[PDB]
Amino acid sequence: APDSVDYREKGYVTPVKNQGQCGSCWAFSSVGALEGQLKKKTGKLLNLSPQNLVDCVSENDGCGGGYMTNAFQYVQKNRGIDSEDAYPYVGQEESCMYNPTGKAAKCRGYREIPEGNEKALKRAVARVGPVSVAIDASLTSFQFYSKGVYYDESCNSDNLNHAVLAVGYGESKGNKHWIIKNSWGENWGMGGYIKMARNKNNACGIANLASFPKM
Ligand SMILES: *[C@@H](C(=O)O)[C@H](O)C(=O)N[C@@H](CC(C)C)C(=O)NCCCCNC(N)=[NH2+]
Numbered sequence: 001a002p003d004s005v006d007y008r009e010k011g012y013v014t015p016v017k018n019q020g021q022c023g024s025c026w027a028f029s030s031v032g033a034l035e036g037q038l039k040k041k042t043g044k045l046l047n048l049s050p051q052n053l054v055d056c057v058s059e060n061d062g063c064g065g066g067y068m069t070n071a072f073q074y075v076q077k078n079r080g081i082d083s084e085d086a087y088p089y090v091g092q093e094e095s096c097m098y099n100p101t102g103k104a105a106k107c108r109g110y111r112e113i114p115e116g117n118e119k120a121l122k123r124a125v126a127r128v129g130p131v132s133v134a135i136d137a138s139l140t141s142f143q144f145y146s147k148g149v150y151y152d153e154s155c156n157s158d159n160l161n162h163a164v165l166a167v168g169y170g171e172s173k174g175n176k177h178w179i180i181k182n183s184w185g186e187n188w189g190m191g192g193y194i195k196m197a198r199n200k201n202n203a204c205g206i207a208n209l210a211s212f213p214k215m
């Protein structure tokens with residue numbers, strides 16, 4: 001794998017969204033990974049709809065939370081997911097209103113990254129594209145993060161609670177990092193992004209629940 005990669009630079013990443021108060025981080029994380037694969041396979045960069053996943057992925061619990069693997073499994077079974085235009089985010093649970101006419105991507109399965117393995121994660125990011133991951137996002141320091149490579153020793157790898165998107169990795173000031181796209185709006189962090197310490201004993205559990213959709 002290359003020393004660094006940044007998928008934002010290749011145009012594989014849509015703009016930063018804002019999930020609001022709904023517990024739908026898992027939906028934003030999922031469409032982020034599907035959006036990456038869509039661009040890589042078609043050349044089109046398009047917003048896919050997290051609302052579609054929130055209302056329809058019945059293995060999950062809407063605004064009460066969910067998993068990305070369950071979301072990819074839904075898109076495969078359903079034979080598609082709508083675009084954001086065809087199924088707009090409203091930040092609260094509604095009945096399923098999927099319309100195949102608005103279908104913008106498909107999914108033929110998903111793959112998990114070996115638990116805790118940051119090197120497999122790096123290679124997945126290098127080979128595949130943006131990868132859905134989960135972290136401990138509960139610390140005050142994460143929430144008020146503004147710039148630099150994030151590291152806080154109180155972060156708990158066994159307390160995953162927030163799903164994000166790994167869109168690259170690199171190194172700043174001799175500190176290795178992952179480039180992480182969050183869903184708290186473009187004002188948060190560095191334009192809605194965060195560089196999180198890489199190769200520091202799986203900090204924040206970034207490699208504990210990673211996965212990506214097959215397309
Ligand atoms: C994340 C967020 O909006 O900030 C959001 O609360 C979320 O979904 N968290 C996940 C945990 C990460 C993906 C590690 C969540 O808590 N999943 C478990 C939800 C409980 C499942 N219930 C049903 N019926 N499946």
Ligand SMILES: [Ca+2]
Pocket residue numbers: 059069070073
């Ligand atoms: Ca499942």
